Write a protein that binds this ligand. Sequence first.
Ligand SMILES: [Ca+2]
Ligand SMILES: [Ca+2]
Ligand SMILES: [Ca+2]
Ligand SMILES: [Ca+2]
Ligand SMILES: [Ca+2]
Ligand SMILES: [Ca+2]
Ligand SMILES: [Ca+2]
Ligand SMILES: [Ca+2]
Ligand SMILES: [Ca+2]
Ligand SMILES: [Ca+2]
Ligand SMILES: [Ca+2]
Ligand SMILES: [Ca+2]
Ligand SMILES: [Ca+2]
Ligand SMILES: [Cl-]
Ligand code: NA
Length: 425
Amino acid sequence: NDAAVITGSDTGAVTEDESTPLLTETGTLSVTDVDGADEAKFQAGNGTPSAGALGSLTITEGGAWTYNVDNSKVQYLGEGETKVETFTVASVDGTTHTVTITITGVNDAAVITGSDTGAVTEDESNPTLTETGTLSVTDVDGADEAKFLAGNGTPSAGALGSLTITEGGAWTYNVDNSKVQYLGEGETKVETFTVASVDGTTHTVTITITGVNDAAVISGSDTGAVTEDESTPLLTETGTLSVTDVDGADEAKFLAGNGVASNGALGSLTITEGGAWTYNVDNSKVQYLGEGETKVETFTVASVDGTTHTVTITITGVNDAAVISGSDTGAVTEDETNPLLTETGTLSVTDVDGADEAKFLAGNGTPSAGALGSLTITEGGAWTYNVDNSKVQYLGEGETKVETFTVASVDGTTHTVTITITGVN
Ligand SMILES: [Ca+2]
Ligand SMILES: [Ca+2]
Ligand SMILES: [Ca+2]
Ligand SMILES: [Ca+2]
Ligand SMILES: [Ca+2]
Ligand SMILES: [Ca+2]
Ligand SMILES: [Ca+2]
Ligand SMILES: [Ca+2]
Ligand SMILES: [Ca+2]
Ligand SMILES: [Ca+2]
Ligand SMILES: [Ca+2]
Ligand SMILES: [Ca+2]
Ligand SMILES: [Ca+2]
Ligand SMILES: [Cl-]
Ligand code: NA
């Protein structure tokens, strides 16, 4: 027996996903046999596969071979990855030939799932705000590709924080708490970070930062003073508060209107958006305060976000002169008694500065120049004048001598008692 000569197309190629559901390749082999044309033909049927062939090859008597493989079975091949399969065909005689099929893989996108959102709040921790989560990845091109590229996610424009992921998919977002202070209550900033699997398939993690209120910082003039009777009918005090607010210029101003007064305040205070305050009180309401006596009134004002500050006003009293009345005159007549001529009367005092000032300094009245007599007064206002009858004898019938005595209330207010001495023969 002489071996057939088998020639023609004995190689073929299919690419993953070139067609569906089958990848198919064809070729024709030709056979000549020197033992005659009954031998110069192929055994029709399946070629004998290499071990671990996924595809199959059939050949006709005429040498027309077809390779078929399920596209589903070659998905695991990565971009450019080759699998070579061989099939043995034979002459009617038994002379063998091999057909060589190459399968070439294409990339399959990774499938990325799991936690791809997170949230941090201003001041939840310090100095760093942290969020964590886990992505997971599958990739039909194999365990080699079913992994993240470890490192930083590519940040959105103007992101404050950063995100790192591990090969297993564990991500960590961190932002400096100092950098998010400027966000107001419930205000949000969204930052995104793009991560990648080995084959360059991307997924986004979206992080929402939420702000909390920062208390305004109020400073400037928060104290003021008025003095009774410095002006009328109002006593007025002004000052300017300043405010900053890290939550922004929207918040760095005052709520215009009245300050909330301390209970028992006699005055009132208004403030402008720009922090200019004005305290007013009716002068008539503070008369009752005595010299140097104080009354402190406080007014609560607020910034836009409700941060409060106190303005403290001190009212200082001044003396009101006592009103002195009652019996401030008296009379004695030469020889009416002996050896003293005596006269009594009672003064009264009332004082706007209070019942505490409604009394006299007890003691001697300050005598007029050349006074013969003298006068004492009690704390209650009862006075007593005495003169020696011997010293008034010189006065003629109906001739008078007027003597005056200055007394004082406890606040220093003076009053005169006037005594008339009348002469006889
Ligand atoms: Ca032969
Ligand atoms: Ca593939
Ligand atoms: Ca892949
Ligand atoms: Ca594929
Ligand atoms: Ca969180
Ligand atoms: Ca804030
Ligand atoms: Ca803050
Ligand atoms: Ca604020
Ligand atoms: Ca007064
Ligand atoms: Ca007064
Ligand atoms: Ca007084
Ligand atoms: Ca008083
Ligand atoms: Ca006389
Ligand atoms: Cl597919
Ligand atoms: Na703001």
